[PDB]
């Protein structure tokens, strides 16, 4: 529209209206000119002695907007209002708007770097509505809209891995190259803006409640069962039985079973670090799955287990989501102690989910005879069974919202391991790049020009999300557990900027506070 | 750049860190050091005294990892060092 | 319209809809100020000892848009979809749009070259709708829209040759000077755009199929002909005959004949380079035609021949289209081996077209008597004959689309030798130039000002083409040959950018894969 | 500019190329060489090690023509050389 007219306003807000809540976030972004306007074939061989690290892909000159983290939409107080009062929620719609674009020309001379705006430069933007591009958004990576509204952020560079040959850095006949310029995109000069809208598919509500009953103790503790159980064999081999008494939950017949489990090693946090094995390199003794001839770690394991047992300091670390308390630099290889990190605990699900670091149980391992005694053996892993129930991983304020279900034609219970909503058609990738501007070209050449004017753009982005809420409807008499701002002798305010302006966050806030009977 | 790492334990925590740079200039030319705490424990409150000096003083250091980045620049000569501090 | 408003979007796409396909390409161009806004008389005498190299012409300050190459419109995958599934295609319409123009002012001081935009500068654009200018677009020259969408390209400078005297660098009384400013053109400042539309004349479909029958073996191999042939003369001179038997194709009467041929020398590619004559300079022993007192090479010869014989490594190089695997610099005189180039093979047409490096046949060369024996002599060249059939040259992904038929009032079978569609009224030349901006002129002078501010412009160009397709309609039972991405142990992806960002292409992709009986 | 041309045959292919420039500067002034492969066989995959150095190392060289363009510049003195490599 115009150089001296704003193409949009600043909208950050939450509006609660019954069973709906609309969140609005606006952030300032900055887009670098990645790769110098070129596509590059990126590849890697075996790194750290693991050929599962090998890949073949492409880095593109495009950047992308990632809105896949709860804190990009929810302030800590609104999150508290959500988890203390509702049984569940789910995304309904999304509206994105990119505006107030500013393209800057950078010029370095002799020890001098000036910056001036280029009023005629454009920025290109498109959304991948048909999912024709490798969707890299739901894999727990950096670059999402920052939690704290005033924080300015750089858009991450779009890249992808395709097929590599024999766990090496070579491509195969099936490796695919995708050209992002081969999509129709809108071009924006300083007065133009871009708007996009999207609606989520019917997805089940995330469960924001913990069970107030144990799965194996659902029977009335005052009445016996009209069922009998084999208890022994007489001195002559006659089978003997007894009635299952009231309250003896170790013996009652069960109708339902706990979800699938796969044993993972348990480690003690600090209080119990003296009981941990010393100097052990976890990779060699970790849970791994094989695929195409290589072994990959599979944290945080499939859903169905609890990583800790409420009241203990032992964690099944590979079944745990681990966040940094602060934003880290790219490529850091420092070894962090637990004092800098935020460990998540899924102990609220222990009345239903089995403990990840213990054996799942025991089964018969032979045929009993008058000469051979009955034998049992414990099992470390057990997959899904008919009539089994479990609770999915909880969502966190600083964790992912959705994940795209891989299109293969066959899947089971499409719920991403890192938590969130599994979607067949998630919010489309929104790509953006600075349109190239050639330097001073005087003569002709059939070779593509390589000399460009260095630029970078900036602007604002606003994301509006409507969420549907599930009202709590309990008849519990006594008070419930609530997430509360409880600190003893605070030296600073959590979820607030400190003296240096840095946003501080000392806790990973889950969703499970309210209870429900089974 | 360098990467000097230090370590401390017990209750004591208050510590000071100096700054060493190669190609030392004449007396008439002094650099303006600048320290940035890029990593620290989630519990860290502490304070940083003398950031623009050669010695950065630290107090109230809780157990954890601390990452600093001292940048020493002058007349046609930019530089910077890295230091890791681990408290038990 | 405005400085801060984009005058167009980015459209790159292909849309298949039945018997039609619409291709859209957008590229970024850069236009230098050629000649410093002046027209120059360019001329040359005899170069390399050949006066066919002499010419007299004009270089103009204009540049031009060339869209005459298939890869400027077709991605490699769309081309594969085209050649594996259709029997033919042809251009129907064209729409061109030039937008987002940016004029840059260049200023060099003392060892400093700054670049700033000039918001008031214009660019001039016009199309030669009536074909009043020398059409230089369909002669296999550089400067077309690049194959890979993200590649920025420089527009080539418009120039032409007119008549020269006695194969020298002097003009004749008939030499014509054409002033491009003597045409009405649109002037564009940064907010303006230019659009042009055009429709192709009814042209025959290009044939994207190879014959699955040989021209001389069309007769049923199970039945004899009711025709007899002269086989000999008795010991007393009586003529003798025999019936033409079933399957003896060497003797059957024919109804049709192969197209025209003109023998060209054959050379062996690498596998057979030890059988090639050594150290021979091809110019002296090449196929040449004379015109106006000078001899010119006439590659790739007229249509009607096959340059290779499927199963051999010998090529009739002068009857072959040879492309570079990559874009080359202007004026390079390096001697390339076949390892850097892409040789095209027309062997699919061998069941119908005669082999370019063999003799065409033999005919009687005397009058037989009781004293003189019948004599025959082979012929190296043979032009068109009634009842002859042949296949035109195939089109390539990296080759020309059309050629303008020279207006002389008399021509035969207007099909360009380099392949493509022969057009009487092809897409008009689209010329563009940077409008001159005088430097600081203080005093008056009747002499045209020579001091100008140095500028260059850039923008985007989008070309939309509609193609008409001819559906394949075969009853062949067994599978057909298809173009396929087949490489053994690939070190990189063909038709993809490599590690340095350079677009790689290791193969010239033709059009002949499907088969049809004659 | 110059135009040095080299040639090699047999299976061996890995080769290194140096850079020579006239009007050599003092020890205190070193140039930043830059090599660009402007021409190579359509089959070439290879790698270029030490582009910004005086010696550019080449490996996995398949038969064909290779055109390089080494540009040597410094304080008020731009230059460049050309080299052709032919593998049989």
UniProtKB/Swiss-Prot annotation, chains B, D:
Compartments reported by the entry: Cytoplasmic granule membrane; Golgi apparatus membrane; Golgi apparatus, trans-Golgi network membrane; Cell membrane
Q: In which tissues is it expressed?
A: Expressed in cortical neurons in the brain cortex (at protein level).
Q: Which domain of life is it from?
A: Eukaryota
Glycosylation sites per record: 84
Description of post-translational modifications: N-glycosylated.
Q: Where is the PKD domain?
A: 1-88
Quaternary arrangement and interactors, per the entry?
Answer: Interacts with RTN4R.
What does the protein in this record do?
Possible role in axon guidance through interaction with RTN4R.
Q: What is this protein called?
A: Dyslexia-associated protein KIAA0319-like protein
């Amino acid at each position: 529209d115009g150089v001296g007219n704003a193409s949009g306003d600043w909208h950050c807000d939450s509006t609660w209206m019954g069973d709906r809540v609309v969140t609005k976030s606006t952030r300032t972004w900055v887009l670098p000119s990645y790769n110098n306007h070129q596509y590059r074939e990126i590849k890697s061989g075996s790194v750290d002695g693991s050929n599962a690290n090998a890949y073949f892909g492409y880095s593109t000159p495009w950047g992308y907007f990632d809105f896949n983290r709860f804190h990009s939409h929810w302030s800590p107080r609104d999150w508290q209002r959500l988890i203390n009062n509702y049984w569940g929620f789910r995304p309904r719609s999304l509206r994105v708007k990119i505006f107030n674009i500013q393209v800057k020309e950078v010029t370095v001379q002799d020890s001098t770097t000036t910056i001036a705006n280029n009023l005629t430069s454009t920025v290109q933007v498109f959304t991948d509505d048909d999912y024709q591009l490798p969707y890299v958004v739901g894999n727990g990576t950096e670059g999402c809209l920052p939690a704290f509204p005033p924080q300015v952020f750089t858009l991450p560079q779009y890249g992808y891995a395709t097929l590599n040959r024999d766990n090496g850095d070579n491509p195969t006949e099936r490796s695919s190259f995708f050209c992002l310029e081969y999509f129709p995109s809108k071009m924006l000069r300083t007065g133009n803006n871009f708007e996009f809208t999207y609606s989520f598919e019917e997805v089940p509500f995330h469960c924001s409640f913990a069970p107030s009953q144990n799965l194996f103790k659902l029977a009335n503790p005052l009445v016996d069962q009209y069922l009998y159980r084999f208890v022994s064999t007489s001195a002559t081999g006659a089978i003997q039985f007894q009635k299952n008494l009231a309250g003896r939950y170790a013996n009652t017949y069960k109708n339902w079973f706990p979800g699938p489990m796969g044993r993972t090693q348990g480690w003690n946090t600090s209080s119990g670090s003296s009981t941990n094995r010393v100097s052990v390199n976890n990779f060699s003794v970790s849970n791994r799955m094989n695929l195409e001839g290589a072994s990959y770690q599979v944290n945080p394991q499939p859903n169905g287990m609890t990583n800790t047992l409420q009241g203990s300091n032992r964690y099944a670390l590979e079944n745990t989501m681990i966040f940094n308390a602060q934003n880290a630099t790219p490529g850091t290889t420092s070894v962090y102690p637990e004092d800098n990190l935020l460990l998540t605990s899924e102990s609220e699900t222990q009345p239903v989910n089995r403990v990840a670091y213990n054996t799942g149980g025991q089964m018969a391992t032979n045929a009993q005879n008058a000469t051979t005694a009955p034998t049992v053996g414990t099992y470390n892993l057990q997959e899904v069974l008919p009539g089994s129930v479990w609770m999915e991983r909880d969502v966190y304020l600083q964790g992912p919202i959705w994940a795209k279900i891989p299109e293969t034609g066959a899947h089971f219970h499409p719920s991403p391991a890192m938590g969130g909503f599994g979607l067949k058609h998630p919010p489309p990738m929104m790509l953006i790049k600075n349109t190239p501007v050639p330097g001073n070209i005087t003569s002709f050449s059939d070779v593509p020009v390589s000399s460009f004017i260095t630029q970078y753009s900036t602007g604002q982005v606003t994301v509006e999300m409507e969420w549907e809420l599930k009202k709590e409807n309990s008849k519990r008499w006594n008070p419930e557990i609530q997430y509360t701002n409880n600190y003893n002798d605070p030296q600073f305010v959590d979820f607030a900027p400190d003296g240096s302006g840095e946003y501080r966050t000392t806790r990973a806030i889950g969703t499970r506070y309210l209870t429900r009977p089974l | 750049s360098a990467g000097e790492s230090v370590q401390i334990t017990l209750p004591k925590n208050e510590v000071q860190l100096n700054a060493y740079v190669l190609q030392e200039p004449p007396k008439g030319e002094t650099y303006t050091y600048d320290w940035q705490l890029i990593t620290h424990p989630r519990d860290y409150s502490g304070e940083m005294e003398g950031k623009h000096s050669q010695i950065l003083k630290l107090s109230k250091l809780t157990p954890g990892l601390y990452e600093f980045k001292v940048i020493v620049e002058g007349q046609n000569a930019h530089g910077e060092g890295y230091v890791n501090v681990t408290v038990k």
